[PDB]
Design a protein around this ligand. Sequence first.
Ligand SMILES: *[C@@H]1O[C@H](CO[C@@H]2O[C@@H](C)[C@@H](O)[C@@H](O)[C@@H]2O)[C@@H](O[C@@H]2O[C@H](CO)[C@@H](O[C@@H]3O[C@H](CO)[C@@H](O)[C@H](O)[C@@H]3O)[C@H](O)[C@H]2NC(C)=O)[C@H](O)[C@H]1NC(C)=O
Lengths: 98, 311, 52, 52, 97, 48, 55
Amino acid sequence: EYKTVIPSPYVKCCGTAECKDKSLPDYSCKVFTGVYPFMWGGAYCFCDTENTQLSEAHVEKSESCKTEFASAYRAHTASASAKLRVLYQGNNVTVSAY
Amino acid sequence: NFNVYKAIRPYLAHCPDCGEGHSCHSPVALERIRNEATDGTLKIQVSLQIGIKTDDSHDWTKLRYMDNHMPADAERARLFVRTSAPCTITGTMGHFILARCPKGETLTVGFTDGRKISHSCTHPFHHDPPVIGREKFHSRPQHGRELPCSTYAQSTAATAEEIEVHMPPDTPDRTLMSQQSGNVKITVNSQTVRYKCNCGDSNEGLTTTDKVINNCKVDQCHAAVTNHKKWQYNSPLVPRNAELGDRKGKVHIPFPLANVTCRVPKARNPTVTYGKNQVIMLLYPDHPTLLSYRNMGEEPNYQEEWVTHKK
Amino acid sequence: ETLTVGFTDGRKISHSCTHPFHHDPPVIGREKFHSRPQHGRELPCSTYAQST
Amino acid sequence: NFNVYKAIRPYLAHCPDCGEGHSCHSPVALERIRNEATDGTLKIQVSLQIGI
Amino acid sequence: PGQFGDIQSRTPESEDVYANTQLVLQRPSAGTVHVPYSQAPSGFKYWLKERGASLQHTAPFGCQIATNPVRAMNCAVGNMPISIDIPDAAFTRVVDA
Amino acid sequence: PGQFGDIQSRTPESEDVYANTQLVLQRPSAGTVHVPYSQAPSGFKYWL
Amino acid sequence: PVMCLLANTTFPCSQPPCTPCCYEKEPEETLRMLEDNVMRPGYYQLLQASLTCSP
Ligand SMILES: *[C@@H]1O[C@H](CO[C@@H]2O[C@@H](C)[C@@H](O)[C@@H](O)[C@@H]2O)[C@@H](O[C@@H]2O[C@H](CO)[C@@H](O[C@@H]3O[C@H](CO)[C@@H](O)[C@H](O)[C@@H]3O)[C@H](O)[C@H]2NC(C)=O)[C@H](O)[C@H]1NC(C)=O
């Protein structure tokens, strides 16, 4: 399972934000104009319409991948082995052999 | 003992439903719900810090939460988690809650604060634990088979599990300022304030004492509290200050995922009678049980069905 | 499928009344959701005002 | 009348699930659940003694 | 996206990750700072629910399947030659028998 | 077992009882004193 | 021994220039020196050194 990582959004008040490309596994960034976000105590910043928000995210393996995962294998030939019971001269002998 | 939480603050964040069908900024909010465990245990990340008092001490009976611009204490006993029905909490630490919830489509977390005011946050969440084994059971049996499964450990140590933390954004506060005869007074209350107005030379980012901007109205001014003393979780619900890389602290996460063994029930022996090239079974399930069969030759003709009643 | 209303008396005596009632809220929009989302559209709805 | 319970004590017993997802020995445990009544009333036998 | 292999890594410890999740950032609701997105849910989780029967239950010839290491056991297939070398000391002459 | 008539008596008050429930006793789980078993559920309840 | 950076100077991450309950004395500086070493393999050793205090 993957986790989507979303860093705190950058809100540039009274100006325009820009984003850079990144090499992260599945990365996207977008700048949204005309944002007027509110905090619990009131509007985030001074400008009303002249605001931009930069949102970015990338996909990476979750911490669970160390325990919960599936392995894709290529199968080839198989080594054979067997456990055989032999009754030899009245005695029961069990031999493990390839 | 290492107290990492001394440098980390609780925070307020937006919550889509605060219990009345209306959104608000809550002392309790759900950042992430982790359900990687196969035993159905949920690991919930919240804006609350549990086990840590306003004073930096690990008192497991207390949680701390934001109240405006300050942390405040509350009893852990008043903390609850609910889905379709109340969940059992299997341990808490910092921002993480472990719980074993009943099947449901929503998740609600909340607590009673220091003023006996209820706070809660609800998110949509599909909770339908995966089946371990070939039977769908609702509770752990006294007798049964044991199969491998994954759970969240109660250990408070971390194993390469980390969260990013950073310096919090300035916090807007309209009660931080008032107009006195055309002169706006900025109340500091011992917390550094940054403010600006439509009035000339109103940009004061270094106010540490109560100050008044003259010949200016309250509607012309904006102010926020500056706090660079503590780190905050890098939540998607809280804005950052810098264009990139404000700062990246790393804090270890409690309750790592681990390999454990789960107990599963064994369905009652079937009543079996025989016919010509035929086996007749009468099944007596308590709960939905998978039946499957195959031929042991070249063409197994595998077939399976779930049996939910006597058949 | 039922609705129960009750309260605790002044003598710590519980009082309750249960009636049969089919409570299955109508679907608003084209999706069946159990809680309001952080992100989405807003459609016309009818509610009971808190005004007295 | 007389108290037959004066000669009988409460006991601890194994319980498969004590709410934490694991078993323990509990002061409260279910010995038998009787549901013969058609009105849906259950009779639950427990290791506790109530009223005594 | 939404299928097994949506996220891939060569080894458990590798930092080299391939992903195709169709992660699209959406505009935030007015008055909020949240970051909405549309992404295909893990194909791993979907696969776990849609796994179906494993070879332990579907294999031909009544084969039993186990892992760690991966093994096919007790397959009733074909035959197996055995060569036995018995020392002369193990034989009794017909005159003594 | 599991069918109507799995348990029978001539009269409600009779002590003469026939039963065929396939009551097979199983080994207790380790560390416990419980007594597990596999028994067909009452055929009377199934019948009802 | 992994070294961490403070102010154009370096030190063993387990042994800061500021040791005596550094966060309590200079919490602003402490957080800044920690963030600048986030990419260092000794970061967690520094984190232990910085926020550890025994009054
Ligand atoms: C050589 O081994 C065979 C097979 O048994 C093997 O060795 C035994 C020591 C055990 O480890 C077995 O698990 C293993 O497969 C012996 O033949 C077997 O003997 C046993 C009795 O010792 C038979 O069991 C009995 O079966 C009857 C009928 O069901 C029951 O009433 C009895 O109560 C008891 O369970 C078993 O059926 C039989 N198996 C076969 C294929 O004949 C063999 O005797 C032994 N020879 C020597 C010299 O040791």
